[PDB]
Design an enzyme around this catalytic site. Structure first.
Site, short mmCIF file in Angstrom:
data_model
loop_
_atom_site.label_atom_id
_atom_site.label_comp_id
_atom_site.label_asym_id
_atom_site.label_seq_id
_atom_site.Cartn_x
_atom_site.Cartn_y
_atom_site.Cartn_z
N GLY A 1 0.82 -1.21 0.00
CA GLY A 1 0.00 0.00 0.00
C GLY A 1 0.85 1.25 0.00
N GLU A 2 0.15 2.36 -0.13
CA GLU A 2 0.74 3.71 -0.13
C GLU A 2 -0.17 4.64 0.69
OE1 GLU A 2 0.76 5.40 -4.02
OE2 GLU A 2 2.68 6.44 -3.62
N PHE B 1 2.52 10.00 2.95
CA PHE B 1 3.86 10.27 3.54
C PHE B 1 4.73 9.01 3.46
CE2 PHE B 1 0.87 13.22 5.78
CZ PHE B 1 1.18 14.31 5.00
N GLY B 2 4.17 7.88 3.04
CA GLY B 2 4.99 6.66 3.08
C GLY B 2 4.31 5.48 2.43
N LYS B 3 4.88 4.30 2.65
CA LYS B 3 4.33 3.10 2.00
C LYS B 3 4.60 1.88 2.84
CE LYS B 3 6.19 2.21 -1.91
NZ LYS B 3 7.14 1.86 -3.00
N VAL B 4 3.88 0.82 2.50
CA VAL B 4 4.10 -0.49 3.15
C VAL B 4 4.45 -1.44 2.02
CG1 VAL B 4 3.12 -2.40 4.44
CG2 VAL B 4 2.62 -0.08 5.11
N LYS C 1 6.86 -0.85 6.63
CA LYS C 1 6.40 0.56 6.59
C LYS C 1 7.61 1.46 6.59
CE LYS C 1 2.62 2.18 8.43
NZ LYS C 1 1.62 2.87 9.26
N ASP D 1 -8.63 5.44 12.75
CA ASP D 1 -8.57 5.01 11.33
C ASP D 1 -9.18 3.62 11.19
OD1 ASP D 1 -7.92 5.63 8.72
OD2 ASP D 1 -5.91 4.71 8.83
#
Ligand SMILES: C=Cc1cc(F)c(CN2CC[C@](CC#N)(n3cc(C(N)=O)c(NC(=O)OC)n3)[C@H](F)C2)cc1O
Length: 286
Positions: free
Chosen positions: A18-19, A22-25, A44, A135
């Site tokens: 995922g995205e 501010f970042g991604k996994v 992450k 979330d």
């Protein structure tokens, strides 16, 4: 050797899971022996940028997750230091969002209610440890097996101060507004009861097998208008204040819908608790 210390030189990137902004996994193999026999892990990391120290937030997320131990919370495995990377177990089934649409024939109402219980047990543990998740959505619920889910992401999780009922912010509103309680949309306050609201929307998602045409965003935009742009959230707050809620999922018994409605009481104080939900579901499962 520290088994929570993952050397960069051995952590081989496979693909994106995922995205975010501010970042991604990423799916990585940690392959110290270099023969592709190492374990697959989820990683992450921030995109190089993260001004309003996303690094400080990621470090606090890592400290939160390191110290969570519950069978319905994704396992911390360790870190990779350079900037830092959070290493977690990999759950190849992915989220309820990728798994339910492919497995409706497998996952009947009984299994949906078990998954509901297990999300509530996760969420009650996190509440017990004085955290607000902020979330809770099907995309953040991972499938361990046909029989087990785990809450899989803590990017927005915060500590409620001792002797406080809520956490205020107005950080970075890439906010999941179609999952948020009115006190979240109106006054950027987040209570445990706010995550209970978020759980009702997640339950609706689970009960619709995360079909994209019945998503909370699809259904709310039908109620208020897919137009509106910068006016959406007011229009949504308006809708909620009038007592409008997401409709009963097809084939969802009224008694399950009535547990979901108790998640969606306008006032945080009027909402059901995670413990009460577990009881109402367990009653329905006997
Ligand atoms: C920088 C911040 C940030 C970046 C992001 F990309 C995300 C978005 N994200 C969260 C983790 C995610 C969903 C969940 N839960 N996931 C974990 C696994 C796993 N551990 O196995 C998995 N598996 C999978 O898809 O298997 C086929 N998915 C997925 F990557 C999306 C959130 C953020 O805060």
């Amino acid at each position: 050797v520290d088994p929570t210390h993952f050397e960069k030189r051995f952590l081989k990137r496979i693909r994106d899971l995922g995205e975010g902004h501010f970042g991604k996994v990423e799916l990585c193999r940690y392959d110290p022996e270099g023969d592709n026999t190492g374990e697959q892990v989820a990683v992450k990391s921030l995109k190089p940028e993260s001004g309003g120290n996303h690094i400080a937030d990621l470090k606090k997320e890592i400290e939160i997750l390191r110290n969570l131990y519950h069978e319905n919370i994704v396992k911390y495995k360790g870190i990779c230091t350079e900037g830092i990377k959070l290493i977690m177990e990999f759950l190849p089934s992915g989220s309820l969002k990728e798994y339910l649409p492919k497995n409706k024939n497998k996952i009947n109402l009984k299994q949906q209610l078990k998954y509901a219980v297990q999300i509530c047990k996760g969420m009650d543990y996190l509440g017990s440890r004085q955290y607000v998740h902020r979330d809770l959505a099907a995309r953040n619920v991972l499938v361990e097996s046909e029989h087990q889910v785990k809450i899989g992401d803590f990017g927005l999780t915060k500590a409620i101060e001792t002797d406080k009922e809520y956490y205020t912010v107005k950080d970075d509103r890439d906010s999941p507004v179609f999952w948020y309680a009115p006190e979240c949309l109106m006054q950027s306050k987040f209570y445990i009861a706010s995550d209970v609201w978020s759980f009702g929307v997640t339950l609706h998602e689970l009960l619709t097998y995360c079909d994209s045409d019945s998503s909370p965003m699809a259904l709310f935009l039908k109620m208020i208008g897919p137009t509106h742009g910068q006016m959406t959230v007011t229009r949504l707050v308006n809708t909620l204040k009038e007592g409008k809620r997401l409709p009963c999922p097809p084939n969802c018994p009224d008694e399950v819908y009535q547990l979901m409605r108790k998640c969606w009481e306008f006032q945080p104080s009027n909402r059901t608790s995670f413990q009460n939900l577990i009881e109402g579901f367990e009653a329905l499962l006997k």
